[PDB]
Symmetry: D2
Subunit: 228 residues, 4 copies
């Protein structure tokens, strides 16, 4: 009976989250460019889409109609341009910010009215260790900025929609399997990278009744990396 | 099968957490001054103790023997002295810091070896909105200090025990409806300004907080450690 | 001897910062739509510009030519669309995000090479208490997002340019008495709940914020980079 | 004119801060076990004391008498027991927490009335990168807890004393070359992993940290209170 839309749900963390939601009895729709196999394997509705191109509210409408309602939104679509600030063009910077941040805003804005109508909703943005740091040995200023920006959007939307029955949170995965590895892994207390399913367990919690009084927060699932 | 000890488990947030763990199928022991009756309604093992005076590792030893093992530790004992710093005595300062912080360290230190031999453990300290703020219209410097100190201890123990299979986190409840917070809730001069900052527009029921505590005490937290998780209806984000 | 460019330098915080830098002996250029009056009062070079519509790197080029170099960049330009997310248009969202965040990136990107050439540089972005909260009673989702995003950019650029002799930080002012915040002060429903949370019991002068900005634009910041420094009269700590 | 008391002022960061305050024209008193030589070199009043055992308030009383007043308090005393939680005794835990935290509370509590009297005051506690992390490869659970606890105390006291004209902040230095940190620098498995995370590629000099401490003990911090200011070469931002 709860209806969920997961962007970037055919691979990595997005797929793991979609699977976790199906396991909870949710009716799920997976949006990505080629969601056929993922939708078939997980038992979800496929919604082929190119979010760097297609109108976000158009996708929400498609999900609403395919699922017969909409209660949960998970934005896990990804893209990145790994270049330092001095080499990055305005176009590349905007490409990253658009998909991670602007699309997050537009998708949530479009989905909110439907969650409000149901009097229950869950919005889960996907953060990163770069929501709190600069990525360490990797040059990713645009990504870092976008993932940190999501924390602000998370607080802002959580404040605004709390009375509507909607909870808005930011799941920040640590280093997950989807001269750099060694130093990073040494900063992970658990001593290993995460399995997508391990991240998805928490995503599911933030998508369910467990988060009834939990909103406007970032939850880091990083094997102890940030605490190190 | 998993064995848990919850201090301050006879009422308030502690009881709600104990109740939530029992519902998850855990064998729970609750500690407080007089847990007999509470324990029986909850279906938990009572461990009478005054944590402001009794040796913490003595409690862990009793829990280990009563439960046949120990996998989860939740330190939810509550106490406070609502007085400004210039009025607070060092004895009062120490009373608050001892129960909330020193005892957290002692209990965790004593419980860790048992979790390590089981190869799986969960330590859940209880924070507060004062882990990130100073309590607003309420004068609680000692409490604020202790609850903020717990974030440091959380990170420290999480780092040290990660390889042992132990996860250590800090659950930070917002404003909850309990006898403990009644002096706050009943007084408009305090309740109104505080509640105006809670996006959800209401205080929480202990059970709503316990839902998240249960998660941090289970397999859902397999890769989650050294973190504070705030369940406050949007208060901090406001 | 140090050359500085301050956007939004003819009014409020920007003007106060420009005055503080001139007081430190820096050669300052201020950019705004009508900087003439302020430039001649402060003893700075006027750079008439519409930061929302003129190419950012072009402004940096003009500043470089007018000052004969560039060591300091302060992006204090301000703009806002105080509407809730459900009422906000994408164009409005973009107006706020562009000026506060995109322009911050573009200006810093254009200025960095000149600072690196000198082997010494200071980039100061301007944050807000909304870099850490959602603005409270004020409906400002776009502004909050942009000001929080700046902390990420601050960390990223600080890391990338640290060895070039450039320091990048985010000065986060609390509630300051300026024309930009006039709407907040004129509505009791915003002013009262906000001010009740400021321990110092008053809004802060632009000059009081500039005292700290000057520090972050000087040798005092030699080992300070990638950080947010909040000057809010105790608001966030409350 | 301004009268300041600096604990741990004969070495490392404490000494650098004392020197910076003297340079600002402050009348300084420095407290440590053997402050005679440092006091003479710096031009400050020596106040021999063992803060790990002597009554903190007696120290403030002595400072008041020696300086003819008291406007500034900097608690830079340092001690540590670098052992993991499972190897640390409660006595060692208490030793670290007492000196770093309890004494901070006692010293501030005793000094505040005198600052309020003057209508102007500055309390500067000393943090660490462990106020935000667990110390990485270094086993310091007690120190981490204490330095994080100070952030809570900083917020609490700042809120309570704001209207008295007192500002309370936490200066969090990164990795500084002092004999206190010598053991970190002497072992590659601590120094290398740590230094690799400092964007500036070097440890700080005590004086570089003192530059910021001076700012937090002056008029520049008029509207800055209840905050932590990290001076770490970009470490936390990495």
């Amino acid at each position: 009976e709860r209806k969920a839309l997961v962007t970037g749900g055919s691979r990595g963390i997005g797929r793991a989250i979609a699977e976790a939601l199906v396991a909870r009895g949710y009716r799920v729709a997976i949006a990505s460019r080629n969601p056929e196999e993922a939708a078939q394997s997980l038992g979800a509705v496929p919604l082929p889409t190119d979010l760097e191109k297609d109108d976000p509210k158009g996708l929400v409408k498609r999900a609403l109609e395919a699922l017969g309602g909409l209660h949960v939104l998970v934005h896990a679509a990804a893209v990145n341009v790994r270049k330092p600030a001095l080499e990055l063009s305005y176009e590349e910077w905007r490409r990253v910010l658009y998909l991670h941040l602007d699309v997050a805003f537009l998708l949530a804005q479009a989905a909110a009215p439907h969650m409000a109508e149901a009097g229950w909703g869950r919005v889960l943005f996907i953060g990163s260790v770069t929501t709190f740091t600069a990525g360490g040995p990797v040059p990713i200023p645009a990504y870092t900025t976008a993932k940190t920006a999501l924390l602000g959007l998370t607080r802002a939307l959580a404040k605004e929609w709390a009375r509507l029955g909607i909870r808005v949170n930011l799941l920040c995965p640590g280093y997950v399997e989807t001269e750099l590895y060694e130093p990073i892994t040494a900063r992970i207390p658990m001593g290993r990278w995460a399995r997508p399913e391990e991240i998805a367990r928490v995503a599911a919690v933030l998508c369910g009744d467990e988060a009834e009084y939990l909103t406007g927060q970032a939850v880091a699932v990083d094997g102890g990396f940030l605490a190190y």
